[PDB]
Write an enzyme that holds these catalytic residues in place. Structure first.
Site, PDB file in Angstrom:
ATOM      1  N   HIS D  89      48.085  38.226  44.557  1.00 12.72           N
ATOM      2  CA  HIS D  89      48.455  37.105  45.678  1.00 12.72           C
ATOM      3  C   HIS D  89      49.985  36.104  45.513  1.00 12.72           C
ATOM      4  O   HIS D  89      50.745  36.561  46.082  1.00 12.72           O
ATOM      5  CB  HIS D  89      47.813  36.697  46.393  1.00 12.72           C
ATOM      6  N   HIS D 147      37.540  41.604  35.301  1.00  6.60           N
ATOM      7  CA  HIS D 147      37.896  39.655  34.611  1.00  6.60           C
ATOM      8  C   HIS D 147      36.811  39.353  36.125  1.00  6.60           C
ATOM      9  O   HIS D 147      36.366  37.769  35.497  1.00  6.60           O
ATOM     10  CB  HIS D 147      39.474  39.119  34.728  1.00  6.60           C
ATOM     11  N   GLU D 177      33.165  36.490  35.272  1.00  2.00           N
ATOM     12  CA  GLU D 177      33.733  35.228  36.368  1.00  2.00           C
ATOM     13  C   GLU D 177      33.196  35.364  37.809  1.00  2.00           C
ATOM     14  O   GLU D 177      33.453  34.811  38.542  1.00  2.00           O
ATOM     15  CB  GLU D 177      34.849  34.872  35.950  1.00  2.00           C
ATOM     16  N   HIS D 209      39.617  38.224  26.480  1.00  3.53           N
ATOM     17  CA  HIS D 209      38.082  38.311  27.027  1.00  3.53           C
ATOM     18  C   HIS D 209      37.210  39.312  26.534  1.00  3.53           C
ATOM     19  O   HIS D 209      36.565  39.055  25.884  1.00  3.53           O
ATOM     20  CB  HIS D 209      38.224  38.530  28.379  1.00  3.53           C
TER      21      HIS D 209
HETATM   22  C1  HEM Z   1      40.655  42.321  49.253  1.00  2.00           C
HETATM   23  C2  HEM Z   1      40.812  40.940  50.166  1.00  2.00           C
HETATM   24  C3  HEM Z   1      43.056  41.768  50.071  1.00  2.00           C
HETATM   25  C4  HEM Z   1      43.142  42.405  49.598  1.00  2.00           C
HETATM   26  C5  HEM Z   1      42.396  43.695  49.175  1.00  2.00           C
HETATM   27  C6  HEM Z   1      44.714  42.066  49.969  1.00  2.00           C
HETATM   28  C7  HEM Z   1      45.979  43.130  50.035  1.00  2.00           C
HETATM   29  C8  HEM Z   1      46.658  42.704  50.084  1.00  2.00           C
HETATM   30  C9  HEM Z   1      47.753  43.196  50.111  1.00  2.00           C
HETATM   31  C10 HEM Z   1      47.718  45.052  49.922  1.00  2.00           C
HETATM   32  C11 HEM Z   1      48.943  43.280  50.593  1.00  2.00           C
HETATM   33  C12 HEM Z   1      50.055  43.685  50.684  1.00  2.00           C
HETATM   34  C13 HEM Z   1      50.612  43.983  52.284  1.00  2.00           C
HETATM   35  C14 HEM Z   1      50.323  44.826  52.391  1.00  2.00           C
HETATM   36  O1  HEM Z   1      49.772  46.014  51.879  1.00  2.00           O
HETATM   37  O2  HEM Z   1      50.196  45.524  54.026  1.00  2.00           O
HETATM   38  C15 HEM Z   1      48.816  41.460  50.839  1.00  2.00           C
HETATM   39  C16 HEM Z   1      49.923  40.192  50.803  1.00  2.00           C
HETATM   40  C17 HEM Z   1      49.132  39.422  51.532  1.00  2.00           C
HETATM   41  N1  HEM Z   1      48.079  38.433  51.221  1.00  2.00           N
HETATM   42 FE1  HEM Z   1      46.667  39.568  50.623  1.00  2.00          FE
HETATM   43  N2  HEM Z   1      44.609  40.599  50.864  1.00  2.00           N
HETATM   44  C18 HEM Z   1      43.495  40.493  50.409  1.00  2.00           C
HETATM   45  C19 HEM Z   1      43.475  38.959  50.994  1.00  2.00           C
HETATM   46  C20 HEM Z   1      43.791  38.076  51.413  1.00  2.00           C
HETATM   47  C21 HEM Z   1      43.862  37.304  52.005  1.00  2.00           C
HETATM   48  C22 HEM Z   1      42.143  36.579  51.901  1.00  2.00           C
HETATM   49  C23 HEM Z   1      44.061  35.742  51.970  1.00  2.00           C
HETATM   50  C24 HEM Z   1      44.056  34.595  52.679  1.00  2.00           C
HETATM   51  C25 HEM Z   1      45.530  33.889  52.126  1.00  2.00           C
HETATM   52  C26 HEM Z   1      45.976  37.045  51.751  1.00  2.00           C
HETATM   53  C27 HEM Z   1      47.218  36.235  52.170  1.00  2.00           C
HETATM   54  C28 HEM Z   1      47.997  37.699  52.125  1.00  2.00           C
HETATM   55  C29 HEM Z   1      49.726  37.044  52.285  1.00  2.00           C
HETATM   56  C30 HEM Z   1      49.731  35.332  52.712  1.00  2.00           C
HETATM   57  C31 HEM Z   1      49.999  38.485  51.557  1.00  2.00           C
HETATM   58  C32 HEM Z   1      52.031  38.462  52.388  1.00  2.00           C
HETATM   59  C33 HEM Z   1      51.817  39.976  53.172  1.00  2.00           C
HETATM   60  C34 HEM Z   1      50.773  40.164  54.455  1.00  2.00           C
HETATM   61  O3  HEM Z   1      51.017  40.187  55.057  1.00  2.00           O
HETATM   62  O4  HEM Z   1      50.616  41.502  54.750  1.00  2.00           O
HETATM   63  N3  HEM Z   1      45.266  37.537  51.642  1.00  2.00           N
HETATM   64  N4  HEM Z   1      47.673  41.450  50.659  1.00  2.00           N
HETATM   65  O1  LIG Z   2      39.036  33.057  31.496  1.00  2.00           O
HETATM   66  O2  LIG Z   2      40.175  32.279  30.595  1.00  2.00           O
HETATM   67 CO   LIG Z   3      39.000  33.785  32.285  1.00  2.00          CO
HETATM   68 NA    NA Z   4      40.003  43.155  34.973  1.00  2.00          NA
HETATM   69 NA    NA Z   5      42.003  37.801  28.361  1.00  2.00          NA
END
Ligand code: HEM
Ligand SMILES: [O-][O-]
Ligand SMILES: [Co+2]
Ligand code: NA
Ligand code: NA
Ligand code: HEM
Ligand SMILES: [O-][O-]
Ligand SMILES: [O-][O-]
Ligand SMILES: [O-][O-]
Ligand SMILES: [Co+2]
Ligand SMILES: [Co+2]
Ligand SMILES: [Co+2]
Ligand code: NA
Ligand code: NA
Ligand code: NA
Ligand code: NA
Ligand code: NA
Ligand code: NA
Lengths: 262, 262, 262, 262
Positions: D89, D147, D177, D209
């Site tokens: 992220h 990890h 962890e 690790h």
């Molecule tokens: C299992 C949990 C999560 C997965 C698998 C995941 C996966 C992803 C993926 C694939 C993107 C790229 C955009 C897309 O693919 O549509 C993305 C973007 C992003 N993620 Fe997560 N994410 C997770 C949780 C979170 C959480 C809890 C936050 C809270 C801060 C977060 C914050 C962001 C932000 C700010 C982006 C920018 C792109 C977008 O809005 O899609 N992500 N994430």
């Molecule tokens: O935990 O490096």
């Molecule tokens: Co570590």
């Molecule tokens: Na891993």
């Molecule tokens: Na390592």
């Protein structure tokens, strides 16, 4: 928590011009003796030329990425630009891109360029007057050469002209690329029938534009065009960063940016 | 794919002033007959007053959120502000916040306020002259009342003064809150020993500042202060949006913003 | 300084399903009696349907723009989504777009959806078990119907399956659109030779998917497909927001988001 | 217009582990012979250690700032991380900070880490099985050491466990962890009464690790704890980037990111 200052100029690869920027670095160190100072340059071509000479010349993005790696957390970026034009605006965007990046800089503030507020513009006019060569006589016009830009901030040049004229009717602003133009300046000089005219850069350093467009031996330089009109042109190859009075304005903008980190 | 235009003014709740903005809406409709036009207002207090009168008066954020819900995809936001000051800059930030939001607007462009480039400033000076009342005689000064701001864009006012003076030495710019001040304007008038002076708003609408600070019955209005100096003050309660020549400049900025959607 | 809470669900226009969301609103009011609570919905089609019924159904952008206009300064947005998928991520982007807008919201935090951390996933498995109908007997499988998504967060469903199986080998997760699929669920049921199987939504409300895909009279519903296999299917048309144990998890996420405003 | 690829791993300063990353660089070069490839590392401590050894080890921000200076315009950043957790992220935020900067990169895409979609998770389970040592016998458990993280993406580990179990009931996921924990893994092994157990890293490289927590001589290593339980532990010090089958998944994610530049 670790504060740093990043001084950012357009930059120059002209050997004789670079001392103006070193002077600014001294002033900043003297004002803020406990805060590390770093440099960057906004002009991609000047960075290319400096790297060619074996000199490190980071972009604002390279510099900030490196300061994040040194563990700086709060950085005041001071623009050594004259107007809030395209370079300044690019600088703000870059600075703000770095702020808050995961594990990077917490806060990146940006100090205003020279002609910031109308209060700054008035202070700049006063400082330019204080900077004039002692040999310039009353009534001899002085033309300040600004860069000029297509950006809306070009309006800073006619703005500054307004403040300069409230000090002395014979102080004139012209620009290489914006308004007022040098043709406008010549028309100002023709109405004044001036026989000796001083030319001073309205850029931090007396770089390529000062040495070539303002004062070059080439036919189209300002000094060449004036000589063809029978005017004794007196170019002064000193950037505004050489002036203590002008430098104080950038220094106050840096104080303001430092305060904004808190 | 669905294009819309969002016209954004500072706004006014003054009944007699609002027609200037309706006129702009007509001009825009006439120039772009197939593109839906929506309105917003940047001043939080004017929106409060209009809502109090039972009138919808969306913020730029409310308006754009509503246009996204209508399925607009590309919106040109035209600033009906005079300078690229704090309101304009807030507008840019808001517009750009909406652009690219998931399932929302694809592209939100923003048209420059009146005094954009130095080319615009020169066009504004020409347009202001074209807008002068036919009864104003040669040599009678005209004072244009700008708002004034602490923002760096306040420099647009002394900038415009420069261009106006290249047309007529007796055209003057003053502001309520910035530079030049009204005291600067009075000093300009004293040197001219002017006996009749016209006052015109340098705001899109002749709102509260035009009706009260420029032309009020109160002691501190510009017209009251001039009358105390023995000057016949001739206030003109027409905003610049009433002028076809001035309006054309905002219309070209809207054309430019529409082109930027492509 | 003025705190508000914005509850955001996918939403439903199904009359019989909407009470689950009203229940959540009660819980939130009860936990935070002095903080105004506002609602928004992430599904554009549900907002369309609700507006058609004469009901206000703001998008997150409409809701936040309106709260800024009411003078809220710090808003905790609580996701009533099950996974951090496309809707949740769109919500984060929107929330963060509003934060810091000129003259608007100072701070907009976002509470995690139900299956947040692996600790949350474990708590959800425990809460789902606590929520099971008293009439379900030991050894009768229960299938939880998640929505499923092409987004990477679809992995939350097989993740939750892992935690559920550490509680009871006969608790199963299937989804309409992601993994595990309903065909995977049927293969799980075939190995178990189960004769009676319960079906519960793994969505906050028992909306269209629960009423039609899980429990519909149509041939392709889960209950229809099970009946064809000789299984007594026992659908439970209650969304997870009806459960106190499940609701507590969203409530803790809201506490966390409120704390992040400080 | 100039395309580049930026490969980003957590990184390692372990001499014996670094070849796994060199192998990935070869694969990428072989797949995309005409596109320059650059490297960065997300762990600040690994960059410190590598710089200490006299090796350039740019952060993602340093690398992208340098690629902008080389005149790259479109860069596909490929995450060599296992899950879309905090490092991934942070990488997305950084990448997107650089995109569109004045005079810098036009477009910066980011390739998904290994466990992206549920389709990827299923492919990873298949690839891990293909990667098992030929000497491992049917029925001997294999424990994959991930990890683990406090981030919501920790759910990828129990998610992957679900897919692995659909291939072989004796394939287990543990983490240093996060969840499942090693104590959970031991309970899995106790029910199986396994006498020989293989341990493989579920990290791109067999770093600190793998060498210390999984296979260390220290009392608390996984191999030490298993030996105390009378189990013959068989650690395999190969990161997943050593596997062609596992590497193909990151390579497809890079293809996808390259396509997103267009
Ligand atoms: C299992 C949990 C999560 C997965 C698998 C995941 C996966 C992803 C993926 C694939 C993107 C790229 C955009 C897309 O693919 O549509 C993305 C973007 C992003 N993620 Fe997560 N994410 C997770 C949780 C979170 C959480 C809890 C936050 C809270 C801060 C977060 C914050 C962001 C932000 C700010 C982006 C920018 C792109 C977008 O809005 O899609 N992500 N994430
Ligand atoms: O935990 O490096
Ligand atoms: Co570590
Ligand atoms: Na891993
Ligand atoms: Na390592
Ligand atoms: C006379 C002074 C200024 C003028 C005439 C002006 C004008 C403009 C214009 C025209 C843009 C649109 C982008 C473009 O045209 O290239 C812009 C954008 C912007 N301005 Fe200013 N501006 C001024 C001062 C400032 C200052 C002092 C700040 C410091 C916060 C600022 C902040 C921004 C930001 C963040 C943007 C976003 C677009 C960009 O980076 O170009 N502006 N301004
Ligand atoms: O350099 O113009
Ligand atoms: O309104 O000043
Ligand atoms: O609705 O799928
Ligand atoms: Co130039
Ligand atoms: Co005012
Ligand atoms: Co659906
Ligand atoms: Na200049
Ligand atoms: Na120069
Ligand atoms: Na004005
Ligand atoms: Na007004
Ligand atoms: Na769901
Ligand atoms: Na539904």
């Amino acid at each position: 928590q670790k504060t740093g200052i990043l001084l950012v100029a357009f930059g120059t690869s002209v050997e004789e011009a670079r001392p103006a920027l070193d002077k600014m670095g001294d002033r900043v160190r003297a004002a803020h003796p406990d805060i590390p100072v770093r440099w960057a340059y906004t002009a991609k071509m000047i960075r290319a030329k400096l790297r060619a000479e074996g000199i490190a010349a980071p972009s604002p993005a390279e510099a900030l990425a490196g300061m994040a790696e040194e563990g700086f957390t709060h950085v005041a970026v001071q623009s050594l630009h004259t107007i809030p034009g395209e370079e300044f605006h690019g600088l703000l965007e870059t600075a703000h891109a770095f702020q808050g990046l995961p594990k990077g800089l917490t806060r990146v503030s940006v100090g205003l360029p020279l002609i910031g507020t109308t209060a700054d513009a008035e202070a700049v006019a006063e400082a330019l007057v204080a900077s004039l060569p002692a040999d310039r006589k009353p009534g001899e016009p002085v033309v300040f050469m600004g860069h000029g830009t297509p950006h809306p901030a070009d309006i800073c040049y006619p703005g500054l002209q307004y403040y300069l004229w409230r000090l002395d009717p014979d102080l004139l602003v012209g620009t290489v690329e914006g308004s007022p133009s040098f043709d406008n300046v010549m028309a100002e000089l023709d109405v004044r029938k001036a026989k000796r005219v001083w030319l001073m850069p309205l850029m931090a350093v007396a770089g390529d534009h000062a040495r070539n467009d303002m004062a070059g031996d080439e036919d189209d330089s300002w000094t060449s065009q004036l000589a063809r009109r029978g005017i004794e042109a007196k170019p002064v190859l000193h950037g505004t960063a050489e002036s203590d009075a002008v430098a104080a304005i950038w220094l106050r903008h840096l104080d303001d940016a430092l305060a904004r980190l808190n």
